[PDB]
Amino acid sequence: MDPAKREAILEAAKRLFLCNGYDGSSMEAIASEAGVSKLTVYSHFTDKETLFSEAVKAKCAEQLPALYFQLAEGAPLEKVLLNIARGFHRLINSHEAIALTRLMAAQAGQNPKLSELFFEAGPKQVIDEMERLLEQARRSGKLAFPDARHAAEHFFMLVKGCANYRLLIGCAEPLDEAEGERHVEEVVALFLRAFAAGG
């Protein structure tokens, strides 16, 4: 399909979730606010949970592109990690990421289909990308870990940090871009220390 078409349905869905929740917004309303037939909307997004999850997928890929996770021969590992950490910190703390995570929280154990879709679209894609990268870094002998997937998870938990928790529950302490950057550098240095090769 035309990029305009997919972007239009995703942006219309996004715009509608940031006013009404999963419950409030409806696929007929998405079709009407996107300027496309209900048929084209079912034609690409079988059900609402699929649509929500796929918009998540798009935002993630935008802020953390697949290129970021290539460790070319001779590439500087520090710069790669730093870019992934920066992209991730922007992603999770963006207004749209926060809104959609609070909608997802509003129906955790009351909506298992949305829970499993949401997880597979956002967190799972990022952890897979990162496990691939960390496996390449293990091969090159730059880092050392028994399980690279667990290391990817530690990396993202460290980057996310308590700041994001506070910003999510409504105690939005005014956060500098300066403070955010000191955080991401400190975390990448901590990760490199903790996973150094050579002992």
Add this chain to the structure above:
Amino acid sequence: MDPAKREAILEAAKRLFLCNGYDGSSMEAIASEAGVSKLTVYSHFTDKETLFSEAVKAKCAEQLPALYFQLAEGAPLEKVLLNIARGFHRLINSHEAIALTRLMAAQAGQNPKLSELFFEAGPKQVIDEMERLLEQARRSGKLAFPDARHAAEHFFMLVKGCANYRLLIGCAEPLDEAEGERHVEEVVALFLRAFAAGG
């Protein structure tokens, strides 16, 4: 205060704060449920805000006794950190904790005053304790960090890892106690690697 009275009042307050909502629970309902007088409740908890605060403080202190945050001279640091990590893991993965964290996130726009009560009662007190202990660990010269409070937040993010996130969004079950133990042991080992004094 008399322990049977405090126990009845907390059990009632928790059950009501769950079965109905925080806004659907009243001091009068808590009183009547606990088998005590309105005056008893107001004598030991000024208002519903304070009762909620005290419930949260209470669960934290049960799973994380202040005794944990004291580093006896020459005492092994790894058992100390393991105890802290095991208690925090239990604290945050309980059904009460998962339910409340979901709620705080799902009602950030509606009532962030509640979210600030929550933050000040639980997360901030646990970080305060952990900062104090990590300062004692710096002074024994076993661990090194520029900012023990940032190190405490790193500790806790690593401890509530990806599994806790999956449980919050409604897409996994809690880990059994042996799995959680494997996780915490990995995390404490990493943290000791990452903050080893002498590099």
